[PDB]
Every structure is written in structure tokens, then in C-alpha cells.
């Protein structure tokens, strides 16, 4: 998951700004980590450079 993507990425629920909690990174993308909302405080995982931003339905 590219870092420049955080500039247009928002929470799928409340559409608020997301924060990245990097576990594993690369020169061009984020490999492992979490995505946390600044309003909902909803969590979204990043595995093999893929963020799972699907609603918790």
C-alpha cells in the first residue's frame, strides 16, 4: 500500500482521516500495519501491502 494513497484515503464508515501504524515497510510502500480512524477509531488491517477497508458487516 503506497504512502501517497493516505492523501485521498478516508474511513469507509464516517469518511474521516486515517492514521497508519506501520509494522513492516519498504522504500515505495507499506507492507504490514493498521489503519485507525481519527473519529470512529475503527481499525483496518494491512497484510501483504493490502488494506482491508471493507465495512465490519
Amino acid at each position: 500500500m503506497k504512502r501517497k494513497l493516505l492523501e485521498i484515503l478516508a474511513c469507509p464508515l464516517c469518511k474521516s482521516e486515517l492514521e497508519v501504524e506501520v509494522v513492516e515497510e519498504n522504500e515505495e510502500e507499506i507492507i504490514s500495519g493498521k489503519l485507525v480512524c481519527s473519529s470512529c477509531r475503527a481499525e483496518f488491517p494491512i497484510e501483504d501491502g493490502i488494506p482491508d477497508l471493507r465495512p465490519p458487516e
Binding site: 485521498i8 478516508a10 474511513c11 465495512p55
Partner: protein
Amino acid sequence: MKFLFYLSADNLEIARKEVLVLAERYGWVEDYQFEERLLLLDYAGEKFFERLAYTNEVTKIYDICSVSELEQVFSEIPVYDRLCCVRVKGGKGKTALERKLGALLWKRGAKVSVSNPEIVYKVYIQDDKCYVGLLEFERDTRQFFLRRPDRRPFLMPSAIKPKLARALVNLTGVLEGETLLDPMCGTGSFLIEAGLMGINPIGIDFIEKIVRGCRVNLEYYGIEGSVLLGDAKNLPLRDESVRGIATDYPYLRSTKAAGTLDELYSKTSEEFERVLKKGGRAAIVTNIDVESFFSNFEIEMKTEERVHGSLTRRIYLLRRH
């Protein structure tokens, strides 16, 4: 400046709108006229012809005349020192006419070569009207065939073909460095076409195996884009963050499942309007009439394409207003 666009017969509505959308984004249109597979544009600005999917040829027009005035225009039209040839489209005795017109050019010092010409003189004959000019662009038909969906490393049936996928990205009017979103991206047909034209592609899909395979398809074509796991009903994106949306919706397989896509159409309609920039466009493919879900949008184009006899595709161009 006058340009003739010789359009593909596939869908003239898409073919015409594709030219007009890119022309309004790249430059300024004084006027235009349609005549079957011919589109005449009085245009100034940047050339966008290499992007076109439903245009076969682009010619810069020198003159418009009748068949009897043809020899006189070939006595006036500028001559060059590079190798040239004449190519006639329309009517009968085409090869004889090309040889005759080539001889008129030679009379004024032209170097005619059929094998290796650098310059191509174009004559389009339609209902005793001759459009004379110089070939500006000719689309390489082999390029879409070489990108056939069955040739990608991650294959899924019912993928949108490269030609239609490129036309739809173009209909959004998205430019190089701008963002095109496909929120139900599948194997990445729309993402591939956008990336090949220099647009920044963003794909979304709700099945993990599919987003992984899509990412491999982008790698395969050498495209720089982002593929995320998400739902098109709840876009994980900021307001006014994307310039264009191009997507193929799930199709109804049975009339017994009528109303099951109502929520998907309602949620995406609101989500697309939120996420699109002002005056932004969504080019969408459905197999049902969705006018009622997109009343919040201006419908710039609606066309139909019967594919199987069981399947009739509806193609819309929606504009945020």
C-alpha cells in the same frame, strides 16, 4: 482547424461522445458535425488521438468538394519532398482513383511511393461529398487484441474488452496524472487502460483473492496503480478526491432476482456523487435501467449493446452537477 474522425461501426454514440469529451478536455471546439461513420470537428489545442479506442483514423482536412472538383483540389493541395501516397475510402474504382490522383501530385513534383510513404493523402467519399486531407493518425488494431482479457495472468470470465474499457475511461475525460477509480475492478480491465494512458488508477474489490489477482495483472502490464479491499457501497475515500469513475456493475442473472441490486445502485450513486470532483464523470455498465438511482446526476449519454441475446448492456455517462 478541421479534422475528420473515421469512426468504428461498433457504437457510433460512444465513438462520437469519446472524441467530443477528449476534445473539450484537451482544447476548444468551434463546431462539429456527424455523417454516419464521419465526425467533423473544427478544433484548436492539444492532440489526443493516440488515446482513442472507437476512432480508426484521424485526418487533417484541406478541402471538402464534389467528385468533379477532385482533380482541381489535387492541383492546389500542398506538395512535400517526403514520400507520399493517396488512399481513397468510399465508392468504387478506388485503386484507379488513387493512381489518377497520385499522377496529379507527381505533375507538381511529388514523390509517390505505395510501399514506404511518410505522408498519406486521404480522400473520403460519401454521397458525392469528398473530404480531402492528410492522415494525422491511424489506430493500431493489433494493440487491443494483444491485451485480450484471456491473455492476462489472472483470468475471470465476462471481463470488459480493452476497446470498450478504454472508451469508457476516455468518456470520463480524465487526463494524465489525474485519478480514475474503478470501485468493482475485478481483473482490472479499466485500471489497465487508464494506467496505459498515464492516468493514476485506483481499483476497489470486496473479494481478497480478486484484489490479489488484479494487482498481479497491473504488474504484468507494468502499471503503477493502487488496488484496495473495500466495498463500492462505502468508499474508503475523501470527498471530491477522484476525477473519473469507470466501472462494470454486477449483472442480474435472473428476472427472479429483481430488486437485489437496488441497495448497490442507491449506495454507489450517493458514494460516486460524494467522491467525484465538481463536474466529474462516471462511465458505468449495467444490464438493467438505473435512471431512477442516478437522478442526482446529469445523464450525458445512454446507449445499449446486446451481447448474447439474453444479455443487453446499458452504458451510461453520468456527470456530477
